[PDB]
Design a protein around this ligand. Sequence first.
Ligand SMILES: Cc1nc(-c2ccc(S(=O)(=O)NCCC(F)(F)F)cc2)cs1
Ligand SMILES: Cc1nc(-c2ccc(S(=O)(=O)NCCC(F)(F)F)cc2)cs1
Lengths: 191, 191
Amino acid sequence: GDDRELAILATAENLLEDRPLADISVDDLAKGAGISRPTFYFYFPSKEAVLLTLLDRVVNQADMALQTLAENPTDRENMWRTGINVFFETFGSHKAVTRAGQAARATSVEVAELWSTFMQKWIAYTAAVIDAERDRGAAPRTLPAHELATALNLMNERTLFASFAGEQPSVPEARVLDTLVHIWVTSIYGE
Amino acid sequence: GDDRELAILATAENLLEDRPLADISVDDLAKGAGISRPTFYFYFPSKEAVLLTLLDRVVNQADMALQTLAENPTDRENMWRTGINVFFETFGSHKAVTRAGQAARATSVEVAELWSTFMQKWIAYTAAVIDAERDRGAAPRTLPAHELATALNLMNERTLFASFAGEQPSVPEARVLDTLVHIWVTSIYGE
Ligand SMILES: Cc1nc(-c2ccc(S(=O)(=O)NCCC(F)(F)F)cc2)cs1
Ligand SMILES: Cc1nc(-c2ccc(S(=O)(=O)NCCC(F)(F)F)cc2)cs1
């Protein structure tokens, strides 16, 4: 059962579409995966270790997609658009996992640190590119890169997830990407 | 005891500096306010009704401060700076209440709706001013005002509270205001 592990993971993702993690139990994941509950414990310490793995696969997948863009070099607006779209698509394709993993930041120290580690990495990378662009004479030296990048990344976290969750207020899903790209391009190039 | 009510409210604010709401009990608020626990229930249904009132006073105070600016009319960068500073100062002066009321959005429907109501109001107001400025020929017609205003407000929510809570990553408290003002001015006036 690496089969059975993937089965447990797919079952968690499906059930998370319909209800929160506190509304799902181990017996539910077990049943769904076609195995007994003690068999479940061979794979995962708990429900929450399931969410953590689901979350970790989605963030790593966003992160790899971001590496892929990085290694293969278009106008500046589009470059930023393609980077942001990595997150809109990756998380937009896994809304139940995104939403539930963001809620679990409050109550799980491993979820909080997983998210926190990848944010620092995403911010460091955004700043490196901002700085690169300043090195080339294409963007002006205004805010420190690393502070500008931190506010931009935290914006996208809040706005993407608000859109995906249908929160009031939020930008409509169909408008969210253009909205973010406009703010990134004007703040990075203006000033 | 409107005295006793204010005493209960001050005691909650002080204890929230040192620990979370789940670490505070009614007997703690009672004791702190110099009254018995059944006397506490005359004032508040629960601990959480206390947080809700504390939160509601801070948001209304931010909101009034924002009305005050509105009724008395300086350059555009500074106008935005003064608006954002209302939030940085108001919430910055009540960090324990801010932080705990943001955590309570997850688990309390009244806290969620209080926050949600004032966000719609803050966004509607930001858009009205963006649109005004477009009417005068001072800002270009780029994004729809109301979508640009929504992403900007959600940015400030996430970034201010991350700074106040010392989160990793976050912008340093001493840099957060300039960081936000730069992004607001370039995105509203650029493109
Ligand atoms: C072309 C480039 N894009 C990025 C880039 C980095 C991070 C983000 S993000 O803000 O949207 N990711 C962090 C917030 C999240 F993950 F919640 F979306 C967008 C583009 C770096 S270089
Ligand atoms: C000069 C003007 N400023 C505003 C203004 C409205 C809202 C905000 S906010 O984004 O910082 N408030 C909402 C987010 C919060 F409350 F969490 F800070 C800042 C300025 C409207 S007109």
